[PDB]
Design a protein around this ligand. Structure first.
Ligand SMILES: CN(c1ncnc2[nH]ccc12)[C@@H]1CCCCN(C(=O)CNc2cc(Cl)cc(Cl)c2)C1
Length: 266
């Protein structure tokens, strides 16, 4: 076993967490003690040799607000990815549970959580490439962490690969939709949409539009507008992520400073 390789015999499987496009995720314990999520990759869904090679590099990414990679199990099929367990599940579902009766202070904290993780990724020149509420998780303390960062690079499903009937049109800037120009600034754009999702309690962005109409709306320079729960200062931050010119969008370090400033002002 290399440093990136976990012995699957050290795993105890405890509960089903869901079955989806990329495979089956279970809750379990490593060496009888430590909570993990065990992601069992659906056969045929991933460029597996590339994914395994990249998993070695990503063992070196670690941040409090980034879902922690513990290792992979590649000596058998399906391959497993072993990651941090996030007891409250997908952020999108969490936002849509109206019982939580969130305060806007909690919503801003969720944005700060994500922004800190993305600032760390940016400091490593690492792109998420599909940042959205559906790719964040929530732990038992209500902390939001960023999940599946970079994963889209190894997804074989062509409907998801290109501006594709499963492509994240609603989280993409004009230069991605027009030219496939991915950069730090397309992560910045997606983060602004993510803030919008949070302050909209999990509403679909451009709710009344198809993907095709959304791209046209963007093409004409039009935008999402202010969620009822977002203050003017919060809206200014998410809106700054959507400048038509990628180079005029902020960095995650600047977004983080802006978010902290608004938290102090409340
Ligand atoms: C309910 N969830 C969790 N709950 C609790 N703890 C957790 N840690 C990690 C995930 C997690 C996830 C909710 C998000 C949607 C589904 N999901 C995923 O992890 C999807 N991504 C994925 C799946 C596979 Cl099988 C393989 C690959 Cl490469 C990627 C499970």
């Amino acid at each position: 076993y290399g440093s990136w390789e976990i012995d699957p015999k050290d795993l105890t499987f405890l509960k089903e967490l869901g079955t989806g496009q990329f495979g089956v995720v279970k809750y379990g314990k490593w060496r009888g003690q430590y909570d993990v999520a065990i992601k069992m990759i659906k056969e045929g869904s991933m460029s597996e040799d590339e994914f395994i090679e990249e998993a070695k590099v990503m063992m070196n990414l670690s941040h409090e607000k980034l879902v922690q990679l513990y290792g992979v199990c590649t000596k058998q099929r399906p391959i497993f990815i072993i990651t941090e367990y996030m007891a409250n599940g997908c952020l999108l579902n969490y936002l849509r549970e109206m019982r939580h009766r969130f305060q806007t202070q909690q919503l801003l904290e969720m944005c700060k959580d994500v922004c800190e993780a993305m600032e760390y990724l940016e400091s490593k020149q690492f792109l998420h490439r599909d940042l959205a509420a559906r790719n964040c998780l929530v732990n038992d303390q209500g902390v939001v962490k960023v999940s599946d960062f970079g994963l889209s690079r190894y997804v074989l499903d062509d409907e998801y690969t290109s501006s594709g009937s499963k492509f994240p049109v609603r989280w993409s800037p004009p230069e991605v939709l027009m030219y496939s120009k991915f950069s730090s600034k397309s992560d910045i754009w997606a983060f602004g949409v993510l803030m919008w999702e949070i302050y909209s309690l999990g509403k679909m962005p451009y709710e009344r539009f198809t993907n095709s109409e959304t791209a046209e709306h963007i093409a004409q320079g039009l935008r999402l507008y202010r969620p009822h729960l977002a203050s003017e200062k919060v809206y200014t931050i998410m809106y700054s992520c959507w400048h038509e010119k990628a180079d005029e969008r902020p960095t995650f370090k600047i977004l983080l400073s802006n978010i902290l400033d608004v938290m102090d002002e409340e």
